[PDB]
C-alpha cells in the first residue's frame, strides 16, 4: 500500500459519508413534511 | 507538491471540523439543558 497516497483517501471518504449522514439527519429533524391521511367533518346544513 | 499529502490533510481537517459542528448542532437541538431563573408562589397558611 502506497503511504500517504491511498490511506488518506479511505478516511476522507468515510468522513464525507458521515458528514452527509449528519446533515441529512439535521434536515430531516428540523423540517420533515407530514402527510394527511383521513378526513372527517360535521358541518351545518345537511353536511355529514 | 510534497508527495501527495500536501492538500489532502487540509480537506481532512475541514471535513472533521464540519462533522464536529454538525454533531454539536444535533446535540444542542435534542438535549439542550434548560435553566430556571426566577420563581413565585402563593400557597395556603399565609405563604406569600
Amino acid at each position: 500500500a502506497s503511504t500517504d497516497s491511498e490511506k488518506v483517501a479511505e478516511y476522507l471518504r468515510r468522513a464525507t459519508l458521515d458528514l452527509r449522514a449528519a446533515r441529512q439527519r439535521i434536515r430531516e429533524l428540523e423540517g420533515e413534511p407530514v402527510a394527511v391521511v383521513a378526513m372527517a367533518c360535521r358541518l351545518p346544513g345537511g353536511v355529514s | 507538491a510534497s508527495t501527495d499529502s500536501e492538500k489532502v490533510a487540509e480537506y481532512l481537517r475541514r471535513a472533521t471540523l464540519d462533522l464536529r459542528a454538525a454533531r454539536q448542532r444535533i446535540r444542542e437541538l435534542e438535549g439542550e439543558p434548560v435553566a430556571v431563573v426566577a420563581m413565585a408562589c402563593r400557597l395556603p397558611g399565609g405563604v406569600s
Partner: antibody
Amino acid sequence: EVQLVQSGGGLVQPGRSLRLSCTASGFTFGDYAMSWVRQAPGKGLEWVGFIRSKAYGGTTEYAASVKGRFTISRDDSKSIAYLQMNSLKTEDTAVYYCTRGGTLFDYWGQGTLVTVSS
Amino acid sequence: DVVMTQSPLSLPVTPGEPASISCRSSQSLLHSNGYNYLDWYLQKPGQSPQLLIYLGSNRASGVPDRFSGSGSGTDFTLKISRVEAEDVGVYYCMQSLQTPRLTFGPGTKVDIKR
C-alpha cells in the same frame, strides 16, 4: 443501501479446488479495494489478502502460508470478487470474510464455513 | 510497530457505571499531517466484526453515542459511558503505520461481573 453477501462453501477433500464469490451492491464498486480475512475456529483473526483498485491498477500481495497457494480475482461488470482455492489443506478449515477497504476495514460481509476433511 | 492492549484481558463489568480500556503502544505514531493512525474494532459473540472509531476519536455513524475514544500518540485509551446490556465480546487495537498487518491481536474480553 450497501449489502455484501458471500457464496461458495462446503466440505472438500485435501488437494481440491474452489472459488468464493463476494457480491456488492449500493455503491460504486470501482473505487474501493476488496480484502479477505479468515478466522480460525477458536482463535483470532488473521488477514489473508488485499486487492487494489484499477484507479491505481496494482495487484495483491497475499502473505505467508498463502503466497503461491491460491490467487484472487476481481471484476467490474457486476462487482463480484473471486477468491480461488488450490490444493486445500485441513488447517485451512476456518470461516472466511469479505469486507470493504484495504486499510480501514469498513462494513463487512456475513461469512462462510468452508470446511476441509476426509 | 508492536502494540499490545495491556488492558485487563477479562475486565468484568456491571451495568450502570462506566468503564475504560487502556491501549499502550510502542513509539508514538504522530504522522506529520497531525493525526494518530489508530483504530478500534468490536466483535460480538457469533457476529461479524464492525468498526467503532477510526483515527483519533471520531466514531463513525451508527455507533451509539456511549462510546468515545481519547489519548495521545502513545497512550491511547477508549472511554465507554454508562454500561448497558450486550457489549460483551472482544475489542481490538489496530495500528496503521505498517500496512502488512498479519493478526489483529489477542484482544480484551468483556463479561458481566459476579
